[PDB]
Amino acid sequence: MEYQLQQLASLTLVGIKETYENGRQAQQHIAGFWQRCYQEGVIADLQLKNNGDLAGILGLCIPELDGKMSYMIAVTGDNSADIAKYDVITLASSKYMVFEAQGAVPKAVQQKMEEVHHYIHQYQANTVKSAPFFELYQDGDTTSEKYITEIWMPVKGLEHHHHHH
């Protein structure tokens, strides 16, 4: 499995968060959530507000304290007046392993995500379960087999992993 190490400063994300019973249930509904955001013009609107910190639209998986899972469609944007109708979170600073899913969306993302989870299973002291992980969707044609979705998994202390000595 190939991946790149990246680090982000704290970021403000603007968008819409929905909450599902758990991670399985979420998968039943996330495609539909995306579909509703496109249909209702939310994607178009958020694209306008993207302040450039991350290039693309994010799909964040946010663990909830009662065991539910939320999914937030969002862009990096400054806290502001147009923002009032939107959900806003601070994405806390973190380092990441960044993977690529190449193929038409969502299938290629679902498949890569399965691989990734299996892969990061051997980094249990270094992944961060309470921290959000996300899909990053750059400009392009997501029905193409050439499309690249990025998958960003937070990590701490990865340099101490014995694989790296």
- The C-alpha atoms of residue 55 and residue 52 are separated, in whole angstroms, by 6
What is the third-level CATH fold of 1-165? Multidrug-efflux Transporter 1 Regulator Bmrr; Chain A (3.20.80)
Give helix then strand counts, H and E, for the chain: 3, 8
Q: CB-based burial of residue 142 (10 Å sphere; 0-12 exposed, 13-18 middle, 19+ buried)?
A: middle
Tell me how far the alpha carbon of residue 107 is from its chain's centroid. 16
- The structure was resolved to a resolution in Å of 2.0
Please report, in angstroms and rounded to a whole number, the separation of the first and last CA atoms in the chain.
18
